[model samples]
Target: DVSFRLSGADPSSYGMFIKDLRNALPHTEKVYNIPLLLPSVSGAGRYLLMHLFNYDGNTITVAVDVTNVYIMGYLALTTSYFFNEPAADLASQYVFRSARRKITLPYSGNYERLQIAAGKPREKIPIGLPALDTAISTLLHYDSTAAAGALLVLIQTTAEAARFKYIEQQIQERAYRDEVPSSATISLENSWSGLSKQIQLAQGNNGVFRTPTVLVDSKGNRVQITNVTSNVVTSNIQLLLNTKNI
Candidate 1:
């Protein structure tokens, strides 16, 4: 996914308008390369996208919803870490809706929360998403260990996504004028806790590089990416694969 922007100010001129110049200059265009969801899984039906990637003789499959792009990205990060070629094999069945659409997994397992609300007056609780679980389970064929690792990576990625999303929302609420809000800092701290925990778990007892954190410089860029959750997520997955042979 990528985006670009072009901007210009009307040149102060005598009896002249900038309209012609603006039209002649050419408009900026943004392009995105999103992986296509399987035709049978397209539209919305308890919606989950299955992604397959092979690394170190192991094919890791991750399942996630269109809405939870962060979790999906993290899974991609893991694939990249292991130098895997990832492909998505999506399937959705046994769907139900509650405000937003949701699907339950075919496997019998307790539902787990994949998101948390941020900066609201009330406590933010993540609802259990069954479809995502089921989709991954089906693609992975109930490989509990790999699924566990993928889920851990997903959790960390989602936490970072949630943090960034909340901060951006706050910035928007502040009319994009105020600096990053205090809530953003708190959100980062909370996110770090989960991210660190997941990384530690993924590392396990491997004699390899431990959890690695990445820092990006966002100087002079209006699009402030002080803490890039996506990059960190990618790093964590890479580290996990590095430690494990399979």
Candidate 2:
């Protein structure tokens, strides 16, 4: 079964954002292009927007929700996907690809320290999330050997649609203001961790909307891209940002 993690700082608390856990899909399978989890959930205020791509030029951008644990929406990375047309399967998309396409997922780092009164200070401990078993959590590691391996998923309310935008805005702010925090004081993720799923499509409700798979350049000019299938570092997001034009 393909699965994802939900983690951030203070997992015990952040994990609460999704009150009760339930599967979105009636059955979890990897074959076929199936949507991850239920289409819509009740009371799920948070959203998980992700830029999860693979090494074989296969790419997709998706959005999921918490509390109910379901997929709200997803889009092809670009028209490139139309031509390449890799298998529309979550099992392949969810699993890690060759070393060439491997990316450092945020959740892979599990080392952490506890901040409790009377507890030993400076002592580091495994970031064992209370939500799931330690072994299960390790499956998300970039270098994991498990067959399921780790699925690369990032979050905001990056759980909240607005929250992800807000945090993303903060990243932009630090660039302009020197006095602003160079980095976040606390890791919202580790707090949320205790963390972290996958897609298919149909237009039923708000169905058939415009999903432009694009990336704007430094000048905010639209610098379109295709799937990440190249071994060159310049072909990925790093180059996407470092690249000025094209």
Candidate 3:
């Protein structure tokens, strides 16, 4: 039960008509237009409607209506604009409904890549906007599924990078160090006797202490010693050892 109509003045005067309507429509009806310079829509009862009127004798309107009958679902819509010619193959994913009754609309264009899922928990998704140099390249060369997968990988990588950066920042802030006491004793009965004795006895010499060692205990715990001084060693062994396998 949704419908839309577009009627405008002469093509040359259409811009002025849009200007006047933009300044005066929301106050007249319950219409709330989003930003004027971008693609936007207005809301109604369980539907989203978009109206575009310009000065080149062009006017476009879209309406979506959904209803559920006894044991059946009904949906209908109409539009004048479409994904450009190169995107024709990618537009097939736009008209299907999920088992959960969600309608997914994915689109690509020279300007932006967008997806919208409409249902109880509505979603408006934006795949990345193409840069100016490669804008048309995406619309022409990218497959929709591959585009979506690449976007997901980009998001995941960016999130992991941010998390690692935060971890580094926290480590720097806390001034983390191997807090095991300077007098901690080590077992010489194992294979690390020579290295252990060198670390224990090299107290006041001009020797450069830069031997890196990896040690595994009886319980299968690994410790990496990067720069062992006479009494202390510096490494991220504790963090690496405690990190979960997953």
Candidate 4:
């Protein structure tokens, strides 16, 4: 049986996304290289664009909707259950929206509160504040384990994506300023180093070396990267900005 699990902020929604995928492509093992959900700030959601690099000489691209509830389109792949090519465009694009509603209490410093709430037995108590008590009761009765697990996933995913976003912003700023010929290159190197360190710190021994895999355009859209090489990866930002002559 092909199975997928939810590991994000909204488990119900995340689970639905996986179920939809399974429904869309029945009787096939669906392999998700990365977490399908992208972490977003309070009251916001993110769109994750996925590029599948197939071993059978084909590449597939798909985009996850912002709501993270359903697959936006049909699953079209060149081959089934093949390994992804190295240096292939397996970059994941995360587009965050700001207008979405934020959770009243994010799982940052409120784990204990959630735990306390979760521990409370489900019974009507004479609490002075009905709304506050109701909220507490809701948390207590809610699935704390799932919520906490989702939060952990969110933290890791958000941190990793933030690193990429920082690098993208740095490159874009450098391009706009064009202050120094080597400024962007230096920033890229530094950003990559920092990103590597962050990933290592977050994942500990489980982290793998991630090459520069994503390139963002000036309009903040992901650009499809192909023919990835050392030189190409290094000069990705400069090339995108058309600052090669500078």
lDDT comparing candidate 1 with the true structure: 0.27
lDDT, residue 198, candidate 1: 40
As for candidate 4, its clashing pairs are 43-100, 43-101, 43-102, 117-140
- What is candidate 3's lDDT per residue for 132-193, written digit by digit as tens? 01222222233454333332322211111111222222222322221111111112112132
> Looking at candidate 4, what is the lDDT of residue 152?
26
Q: Which runs in model 2 stand beyond 4 Å of their true positions?
A: 1-57, 60-63, 68-142, 145-153, 160-166, 173-246
lDDT of 3: 0.25
Q: Model 1 off-target regions past 4 Å?
A: 1-42, 45-52, 68-91, 94-146, 157-186, 189-246
Worst 10 residues of 4 by lDDT: 237-246
lDDT of each: 0.27, 0.25, 0.25, 0.27
Residues 70-126, model 2: lDDT tens digits: 233333322111001122122124332222333322222122211221132212221
* Comparison by TM-score, 2 against 3, better one: 2
Please, what's the RMSD in Å of model 2?
20.0
Tens digits of per-residue lDDT for model 4, 3-22: 12211213343233333442
Model 4, stretches more than 4 Å misplaced? 1-103, 106-141, 144-146, 154-246
